[PDB]
Amino acid sequence: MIVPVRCFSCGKVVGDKWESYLNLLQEDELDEGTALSRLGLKRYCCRRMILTHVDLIEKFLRYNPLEKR
Amino acid sequence: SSRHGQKGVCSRKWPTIDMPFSETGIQPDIIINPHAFPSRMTIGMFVESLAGKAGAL
Amino acid sequence: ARTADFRTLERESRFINPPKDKSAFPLLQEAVQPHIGSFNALTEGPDGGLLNLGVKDIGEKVIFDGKPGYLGNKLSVSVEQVSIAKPMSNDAVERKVYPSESRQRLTSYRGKLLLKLKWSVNNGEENLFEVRDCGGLPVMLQSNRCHLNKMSPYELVQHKEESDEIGGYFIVNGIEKLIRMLIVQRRNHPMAIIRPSFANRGASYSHYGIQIRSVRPDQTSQTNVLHYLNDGQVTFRFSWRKNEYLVPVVMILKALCHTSDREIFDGIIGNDVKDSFLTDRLELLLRGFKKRYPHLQNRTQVLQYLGDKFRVVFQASPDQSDLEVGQEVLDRIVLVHLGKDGSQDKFRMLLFMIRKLYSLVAGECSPDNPDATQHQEVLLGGFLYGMILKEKIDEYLQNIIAQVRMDINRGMAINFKDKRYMSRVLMRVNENIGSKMQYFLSTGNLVSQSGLDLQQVSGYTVVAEKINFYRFISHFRMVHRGSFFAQLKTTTVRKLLPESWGFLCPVHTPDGSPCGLLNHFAHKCRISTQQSDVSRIPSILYSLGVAPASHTFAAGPSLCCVQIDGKIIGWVSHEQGKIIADTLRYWKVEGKTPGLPIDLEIGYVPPSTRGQYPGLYLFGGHSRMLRPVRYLPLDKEDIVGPFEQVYMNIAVTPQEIQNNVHTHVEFTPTNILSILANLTPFSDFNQSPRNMYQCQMGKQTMGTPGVALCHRSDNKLYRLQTGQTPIVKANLYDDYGMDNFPNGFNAVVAVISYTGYDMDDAMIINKSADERGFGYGT
Amino acid sequence: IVMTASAAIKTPQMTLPIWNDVSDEQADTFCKSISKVLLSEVIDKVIVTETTGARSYVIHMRFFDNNEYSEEYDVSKEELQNVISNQFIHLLEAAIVKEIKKQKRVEANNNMNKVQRDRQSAIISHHRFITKYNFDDESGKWCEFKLELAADTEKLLMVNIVEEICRKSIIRQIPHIDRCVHPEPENGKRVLVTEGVNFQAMWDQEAFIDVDGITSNDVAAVLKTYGVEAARNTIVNEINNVFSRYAISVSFRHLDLIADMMTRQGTYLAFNRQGMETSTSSFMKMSYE
Amino acid sequence: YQRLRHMVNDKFQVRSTGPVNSLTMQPVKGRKRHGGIRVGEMERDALIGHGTSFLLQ
Amino acid sequence: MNRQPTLHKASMMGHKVRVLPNEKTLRLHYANTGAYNADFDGDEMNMHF
Amino acid sequence: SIPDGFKKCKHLKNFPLNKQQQVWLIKFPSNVDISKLKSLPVTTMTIDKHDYKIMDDTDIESSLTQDNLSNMTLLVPSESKESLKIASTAKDNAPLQFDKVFSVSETAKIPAIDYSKVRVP
Amino acid sequence: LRLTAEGNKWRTDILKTSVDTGREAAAEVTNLDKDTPADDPELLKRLQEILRDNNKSGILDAVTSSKVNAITSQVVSKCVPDGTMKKFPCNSMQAMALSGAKGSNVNVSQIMCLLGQQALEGRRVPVMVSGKTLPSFKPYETDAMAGGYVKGRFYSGIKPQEYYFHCMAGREGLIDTAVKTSRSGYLQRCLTKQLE
Amino acid sequence: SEIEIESVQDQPSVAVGSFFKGFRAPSDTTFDLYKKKKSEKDEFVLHGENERLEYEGYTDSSSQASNQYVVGLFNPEKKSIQLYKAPVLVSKVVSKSSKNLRGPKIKSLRNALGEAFGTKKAKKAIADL
Amino acid sequence: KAQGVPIPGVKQALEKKEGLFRKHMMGKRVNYAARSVISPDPNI
Amino acid sequence: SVVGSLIFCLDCGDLLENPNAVLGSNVECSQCKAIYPKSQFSNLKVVTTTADDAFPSSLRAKKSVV
RNA sequence: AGACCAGGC
DNA sequence: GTCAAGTACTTACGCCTGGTCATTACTAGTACTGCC
Ligand SMILES: Nc1nc2c(ncn2[C@@H]2O[C@H](COP(=O)(O)CP(=O)(O)OP(=O)(O)O)[C@@H](O)[C@H]2O)c(=O)[nH]1
Ligand SMILES: [Mg+2]
Ligand SMILES: [Zn+2]
Numbered sequence A: 001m002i003v004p005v006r007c008f009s010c011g012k013v014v015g016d017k018w019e020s021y022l023n024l025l026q027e028d029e030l031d032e033g034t035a036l037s038r039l040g041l042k043r044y045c046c047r048r049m050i051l052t053h054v055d056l057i058e059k060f061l062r063y064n065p066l067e068k069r
Numbered sequence B: 001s002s003r004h005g006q007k008g009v010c011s012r013k014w015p016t017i018d019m020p021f022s023e024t025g026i027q028p029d030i031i032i033n034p035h036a037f038p039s040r041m042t043i044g045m046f047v048e049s050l051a052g053k054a055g056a057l
Numbered sequence C: 001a002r003t004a005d006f007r008t009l010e011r012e013s014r015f016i017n018p019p020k021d022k023s024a025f026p027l028l029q030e031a032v033q034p035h036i037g038s039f040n041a042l043t044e045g046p047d048g049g050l051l052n053l054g055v056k057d058i059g060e061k062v063i064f065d066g067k068p069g070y071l072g073n074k075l076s077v078s079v080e081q082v083s084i085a086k087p088m089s090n091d092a093v094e095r096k097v098y099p100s101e102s103r104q105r106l107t108s109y110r111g112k113l114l115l116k117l118k119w120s121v122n123n124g125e126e127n128l129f130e131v132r133d134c135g136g137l138p139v140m141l142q143s144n145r146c147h148l149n150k151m152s153p154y155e156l157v158q159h160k161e162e163s164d165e166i167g168g169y170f171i172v173n174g175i176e177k178l179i180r181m182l183i184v185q186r187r188n189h190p191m192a193i194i195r196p197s198f199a200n201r202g203a204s205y206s207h208y209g210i211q212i213r214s215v216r217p218d219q220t221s222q223t224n225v226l227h228y229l230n231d232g233q234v235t236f237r238f239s240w241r242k243n244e245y246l247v248p249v250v251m252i253l254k255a256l257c258h259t260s261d262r263e264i265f266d267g268i269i270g271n272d273v274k275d276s277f278l279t280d281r282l283e284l285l286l287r288g289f290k291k292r293y294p295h296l297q298n299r300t301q302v303l304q305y306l307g308d309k310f311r312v313v314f315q316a317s318p319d320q321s322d323l324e325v326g327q328e329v330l331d332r333i334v335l336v337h338l339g340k341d342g343s344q345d346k347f348r349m350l351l352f353m354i355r356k357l358y359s360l361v362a363g364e365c366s367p368d369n370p371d372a373t374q375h376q377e378v379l380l381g382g383f384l385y386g387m388i389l390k391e392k393i394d395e396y397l398q399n400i401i402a403q404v405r406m407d408i409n410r411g412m413a414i415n416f417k418d419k420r421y422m423s424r425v426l427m428r429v430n431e432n433i434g435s436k437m438q439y440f441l442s443t444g445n446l447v448s449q450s451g452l453d454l455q456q457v458s459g460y461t462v463v464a465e466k467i468n469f470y471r472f473i474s475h476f477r478m479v480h481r482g483s484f485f486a487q488l489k490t491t492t493v494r495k496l497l498p499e500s501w502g503f504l505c506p507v508h509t510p511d512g513s514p515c516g517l518l519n520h521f522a523h524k525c526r527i528s529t530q531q532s533d534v535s536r537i538p539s540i541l542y543s544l545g546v547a548p549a550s551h552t553f554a555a556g557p558s559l560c561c562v563q564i565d566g567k568i569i570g571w572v573s574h575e576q577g578k579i580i581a582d583t584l585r586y587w588k589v590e591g592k593t594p595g596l597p598i599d600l601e602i603g604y605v606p607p608s609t610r611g612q613y614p615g616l617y618l619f620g621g622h623s624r625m626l627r628p629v630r631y632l633p634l635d636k637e638d639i640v641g642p643f644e645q646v647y648m649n650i651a652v653t654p655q656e657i658q659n660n661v662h663t664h665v666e667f668t669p670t671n672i673l674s675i676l677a678n679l680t681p682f683s684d685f686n687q688s689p690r691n692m693y694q695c696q697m698g699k700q701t702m703g704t705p706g707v708a709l710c711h712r713s714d715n716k717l718y719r720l721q722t723g724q725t726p727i728v729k730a731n732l733y734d735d736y737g738m739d740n741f742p743n744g745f746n747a748v749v750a751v752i753s754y755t756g757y758d759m760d761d762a763m764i765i766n767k768s769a770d771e772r773g774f775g776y777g778t
Numbered sequence D: 001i002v003m004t005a006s007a008a009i010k011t012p013q014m015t016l017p018i019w020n021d022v023s024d025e026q027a028d029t030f031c032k033s034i035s036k037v038l039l040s041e042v043i044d045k046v047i048v049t050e051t052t053g054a055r056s057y058v059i060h061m062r063f064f065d066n067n068e069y070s071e072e073y074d075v076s077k078e079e080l081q082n083v084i085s086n087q088f089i090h091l092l093e094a095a096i097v098k099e100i101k102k103q104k105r106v107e108a109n110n111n112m113n114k115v116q117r118d119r120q121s122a123i124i125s126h127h128r129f130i131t132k133y134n135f136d137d138e139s140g141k142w143c144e145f146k147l148e149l150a151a152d153t154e155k156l157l158m159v160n161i162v163e164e165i166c167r168k169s170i171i172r173q174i175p176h177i178d179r180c181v182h183p184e185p186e187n188g189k190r191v192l193v194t195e196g197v198n199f200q201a202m203w204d205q206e207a208f209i210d211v212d213g214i215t216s217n218d219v220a221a222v223l224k225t226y227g228v229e230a231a232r233n234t235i236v237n238e239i240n241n242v243f244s245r246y247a248i249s250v251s252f253r254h255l256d257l258i259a260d261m262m263t264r265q266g267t268y269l270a271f272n273r274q275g276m277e278t279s280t281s282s283f284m285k286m287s288y289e
Numbered sequence E: 001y002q003r004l005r006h007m008v009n010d011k012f013q014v015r016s017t018g019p020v021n022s023l024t025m026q027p028v029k030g031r032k033r034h035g036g037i038r039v040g041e042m043e044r045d046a047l048i049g050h051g052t053s054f055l056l057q
Numbered sequence F: 001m002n003r004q005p006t007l008h009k010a011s012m013m014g015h016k017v018r019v020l021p022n023e024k025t026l027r028l029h030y031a032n033t034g035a036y037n038a039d040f041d042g043d044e045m046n047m048h049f
Numbered sequence G: 001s002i003p004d005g006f007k008k009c010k011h012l013k014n015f016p017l018n019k020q021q022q023v024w025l026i027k028f029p030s031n032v033d034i035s036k037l038k039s040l041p042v043t044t045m046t047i048d049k050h051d052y053k054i055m056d057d058t059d060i061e062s063s064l065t066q067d068n069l070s071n072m073t074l075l076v077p078s079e080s081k082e083s084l085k086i087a088s089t090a091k092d093n094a095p096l097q098f099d100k101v102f103s104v105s106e107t108a109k110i111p112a113i114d115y116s117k118v119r120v121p
Numbered sequence H: 001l002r003l004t005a006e007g008n009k010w011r012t013d014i015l016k017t018s019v020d021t022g023r024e025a026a027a028e029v030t031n032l033d034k035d036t037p038a039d040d041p042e043l044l045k046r047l048q049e050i051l052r053d054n055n056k057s058g059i060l061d062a063v064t065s066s067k068v069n070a071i072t073s074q075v076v077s078k079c080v081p082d083g084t085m086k087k088f089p090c091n092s093m094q095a096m097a098l099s100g101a102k103g104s105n106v107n108v109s110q111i112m113c114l115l116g117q118q119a120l121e122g123r124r125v126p127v128m129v130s131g132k133t134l135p136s137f138k139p140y141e142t143d144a145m146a147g148g149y150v151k152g153r154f155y156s157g158i159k160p161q162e163y164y165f166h167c168m169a170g171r172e173g174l175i176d177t178a179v180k181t182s183r184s185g186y187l188q189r190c191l192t193k194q195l196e
Numbered sequence I: 001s002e003i004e005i006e007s008v009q010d011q012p013s014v015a016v017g018s019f020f021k022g023f024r025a026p027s028d029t030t031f032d033l034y035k036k037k038k039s040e041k042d043e044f045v046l047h048g049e050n051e052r053l054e055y056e057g058y059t060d061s062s063s064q065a066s067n068q069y070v071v072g073l074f075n076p077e078k079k080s081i082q083l084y085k086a087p088v089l090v091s092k093v094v095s096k097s098s099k100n101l102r103g104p105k106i107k108s109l110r111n112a113l114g115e116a117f118g119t120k121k122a123k124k125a126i127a128d129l
Numbered sequence J: 001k002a003q004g005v006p007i008p009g010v011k012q013a014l015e016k017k018e019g020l021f022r023k024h025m026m027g028k029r030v031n032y033a034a035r036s037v038i039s040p041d042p043n044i
Numbered sequence K: 001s002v003v004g005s006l007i008f009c010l011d012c013g014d015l016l017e018n019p020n021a022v023l024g025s026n027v028e029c030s031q032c033k034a035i036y037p038k039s040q041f042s043n044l045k046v047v048t049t050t051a052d053d054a055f056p057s058s059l060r061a062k063k064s065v066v
Numbered sequence L: 001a002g003a004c005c006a007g008g009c
Numbered sequence M: 001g002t003c004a005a006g007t008a009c010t011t012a013c014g015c016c017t018g019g020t021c022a023t024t025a026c027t028a029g030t031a032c033t034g035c036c
């Protein structure tokens, strides 16, 4: 739903790389191979988190019960 | 399950220091038996394993 | 260059702000157009939708006084217009109730049903038009009577629904019910049928017969079966209530129009006068009618005989003469898809149906397989919802006569012209039709006093799960054959037949007891839901070489018959008939012709030796099965059907085109598989029972049902916490918006015997993966 | 075998051991005598000619060449005349009279030899309303006989009538036997398999068939003629070769008791509600169905 | 992979005693009604074939 | 222990018990599964005490 | 018993009925300008720079193997130019059956499949 | 489950023999002469007569299946184990197939050599009313591929018209699994009550 | 080859009727030709009379919106032909003996057993006991 | 045996599967029993 | 007006009576009430061959093979 | 306790 | 007395889990209200 802290297979902290990854794809126009490599994701167990994370919490957060719309 | 009809219950949440590990440093997080393949002939799961790992690299 | 791609920068942007214009992923909405577009067709369209046309077929029903040899006053009561309103709530001025509010109340999202009556007296002295609300009718979501109709995915979020939320389902008592599709015999086409159960009708019944399933313009059905007798004659068969009737057809042939007795001979026999099989079996028919019925020598005397017999069971009034109730037999039973003012066209089709039955017993034809999807048609669930709405306002229009039946019998204070008398009797009848529809959706049972033209009686509604989005999209593509066929120890109805190429998915079928019976569509198979044009097509068949059906004297397999939607347009030879099957195909794809639609199905059956009955059959009506294909001269999209497909050579890939034998090619060889069958990766490498398991298990996964889970109130719901998009995925995965609904996790899977705890089918997980949130769900 | 005790078996057979002395050519020509020949199997086509105006039928029927059917079926020209005379017209009259009752709801000259007039005179004498008969006495190619009706009768088909009587008229039928086939010798022994069970009629062919080695398929037809213990032996050998096709090994101690339970009364009792009506325990019968 | 909805927690029904049926005094059908599993006809005869007879009773 | 369909008599046997501490599932050895005809794709099977 | 507008024709035109002359019933679609035509094949022809297919339909109104099977009886005017009668010229009290039936019909060329542009390697 | 470059050359040259098997088997059944062309009007007349009968089409589909299964045995006995890239005992696929751990030789035949003839209820793939077996094939062709003989291993993959024939045989195994046990379970139910 | 055309009769001159095989009539039986001036979708009515029959016909207004039948009279010595724009009329023979035969208006339970099912008859045989 | 959806009489509470002999005498629900999914286990 | 074993009326197409179930010299139409003589209705002749599939045999199968 | 529906092996 | 043609009748794998639905018309009565 939101970015997983501490990837599943080895245990490297991964959860802080998500918003830097969207920076390294949008502002600095890099492909997904370089942008995972610059974030220190060398093992492919780490590399399949940030590559394939859906980040579906942004679709959840548009249903706010505590504000008029 | 996989996406190729390879269903099966979990059997023991096997501890990390008792799992196989690579020269890369990783350890898998699902072990599957190879004997579930030849009677079932789900080679689309074998070629997904190449296509998955070549994709994440 | 990427061979495929996830779009991270696009799918994150579409999560932040949904599009203020029309929705992205429009291919997801084309998978529910058979459900949405059928409910639209019963409310709007030509002639006021398919519920105003179903009112007109019920007509006027009368009941007389006992006040004095006239009977009294007529009371020609009727309905003339039914209309559905959008759901509104009453808290003074009415507010718009949105179905988010209806899920939380655990009520039924339903709109107002408004019938207006026609309380006529004395054949038109005065009329009392009074609009009467008949309870809350359950409206389905994202139709033209739902408030989610023309909403953007931005505005669907602001009304709490979901961004790419497809409708297609009814909310009944807070439960998202859903009416299934049903596969059934094609309309307007008499298929020659061999059944051993045709011989149990009585004495000397053969096993040969023919069977047309006509449909009225309000999508209500009626069968008309001809049996062959070994005595030498034939026998019509129908059913009005839930019981059968058996008429000799020469009575029906002499009732439909004014006939010379050689017209019955000239219609069956063409120029093959020297055919001794066909003459001698026809000797028994006409002499056997003059023997049994020595009277009845013109049209108006046959018609009074047939009206007197079926008078007491058609609930005919004491007003109706025997002659005008005889036409009421013919207007509502025999080949009703021509309707009134089609007595000649009903007559020619009967003479066609005799000769096809005489050519069946001669061995010169083959029995048409009723289980093969060549001869199949779809009940859309919306048209079933209009078939049931006709017979609940037919019964309601009869309940207000059974109330002035007792009022005549018991009471006396009766004045049919009084406004307060109408307002007193209508407070005594059960007007609540919307509860009789909500009972249908909540239960599935089909309570009708005139049991409809389909076999089963239960299981018409199934709870749409929303247990997974793969499960939820699968309810809108599933096709069930019937509950008659499940409780049946045969095998040949469950087989995968090659006529289902690109219509039924070969893979997506549940293992176990519903195998072969419940099966889904290929994803490009779309169902026609509205009447395509017919009107200009005979004007551009007569100039092409067809001599018309009123100046012909032709029948039999030696010629070919030209039929647009079940009526004979004319007669033409086999050699010319194949030219104007190919010329209309070139003219319907080249869309410069103003009368041939692209959505037309031109089924040409070439002449053979003891094969199917030859003839050119054009179909353009509702409820057909259609799929796109690419036509090789002037490369464009051509839209074909199952009856059409079994005589043309479409090639599966543009490299296997062979010289001068192939006409079409598929756009891709992936539009034969279903929604769920295209999403399994490298499907052409698995054993086929293992591809059929992923279609079953993959829609049983713990995934994400939606994102409106704060505003849902469903009794059980499975949500997986952190889902991912796959590395290995088909290009249809990113096309149906399946990134909106993750279902699993890219797991580092080691194919190894290492453990001993995973041998037979078992598997194990890393422990400290599951300590880190691997595969978590609530 | 087990559940229904079907004496009306779906496909009865019979194994006939050929002797070690008689020839293989002496077998596949011997089976042409046992295997039945319908009158359907010799007729090319039947051309009727109905005349009216005193309705009168001309039932002309065309065979094949005598060098063609007597080679295949070994049917003489004289025997084909008797089946028409003494089997076919008698069954044709049994259907025409059956209908008229219930409807009330190229060739040579004639005087070649007077035995043709005499043989015509018997058919007019013995039958009901046949007024002519002739048979191809030099080639056997055609038979032709008139058939008269009155004007009271409505129209008969008399082709569908004539066909079905040709399908029921038999040239040379051994009773309850349809076809005798000579397959290849499976595991040494010479074997002749028929498509019908009649042990009495196969006891006449001593010189061709070993009569003391005839096993069979129908476990009730061998119960009728070879006593009880041959049906007990047939039921084991017919239930052994249903596990032998599928290569399933099940021992002869289970197949013995299922045999001996089904023949425990001397008759052949199934395992169903009919075969258990002869039993002491009433709650066992009240538990089954 | 995929996680299916067939968890163990919708299983592991166990009964020592509990509610009984009214007109038979037999255990009740159901996991949620805290009832027993059935030993039907196909389990009864296979409990005769061992020759054990106190296990049948 | 017992597993449906109880076709032959060796689909309903008698076992000793070793009580295991962790999770809510029965633990069967592989030699027994040839005679119960049991795979581990979600088979459940009875336990009569 | 005459419905609305159905005016009865007072006077009619010529019909010269006497290897002799033969009566042809020829079909035309409604979009054919018959008011100036000169040729007719036995095949195809040209009308307004467009080809039309022409066949022989003798074996529908009659048969090609059997005499006297005609149905379309021709109506001719009387010996008054005032009313219509059955055609009769043989003193047999039988209608004058048609000999040759020509059916002018539309046709259009389907292009052949270009095997070099759709068979992509 | 790969084969050598020598092995696939063996495989793809025995499968070239199957390009004329469906016509030689058709001309044997219909009793026309050998070396008749596949578009012979005398052949196409009698093949249409074979389709209309159930019993005459049972022997067309039995002689042709008897020959394409003889092509199958030539492929498997040459390519296995002699044309395998990794051999026994290092070949983990064939090690658990020879030793009976899990699988069979007919399974590794479909994985590594040839998927084979797709058998229906004793027959080949069922035919339409027109004579086509599928819309991809011309009406009444004497090709072995058109009657369900597929030449694609699971390692390389099956063509979309071979995939649809493999779904017919796959469903039939699931239909006999589900509904036909109601016929055998009542056999043991009748057999036990008498013998209890 | 080729066929030459002399003239085209643009007026209603002759017509075509199609009854059945073997339709004859006495020679005094003459016919009537009717016409309403629409555009060139003409709709005619045939009417005729002898003592004991009526001969009435009509055009097929559903099929004459695109057809145009023409009768020709060909000289085989020449190649010339005339063209007569003649309609083709659906026609029928109306009798006079059985024309106005009619029963009553309303002939004042078991009545639906002439057209009933094979076990509908067996159940009402039980209803008489 | 009674002409008339219908109400089950006292014969039909005995006859078939879902009767009394087959459903409640030849096979019964039992106490002291469990049922759960199985997982494989060596070291047993 | 004679096709097969049956006859029709020349004036309205009605199926006439059986000419041997009706008395001498006259056959009357039941709708026109026009009368045809019994002469010109001399004999009703009809040939009817069996359907060339009605007799399946081993010897029939050798017809097209040879 | 049933009727139906959805399943699991 | 013997043999039929047609009927009437019974069967149809085992176990396990979830959900939903469930009598309708009417008829006479007591009470509400519009009325003079
Ligand atoms: N008596 C019944 N047994 C069944 C039924 N359904 C499943 N089963 C049992 O469950 C098992 C199901 O096996 P499958 O259908 O999956 C065939 P499959 O090749 O997938 O088995 P594996 O090779 O073990 O995976 C099988 O052993 C059956 O004995 C049923 O309806 N009736
Ligand atoms: Mg299992
Ligand atoms: Zn990692």
Ligand SMILES: [Zn+2]
Binding pocket: K009, K010, K011, K012, K013, K014, K029, K030, K031, K032, K033, K034
């Ligand atoms: Zn007449």
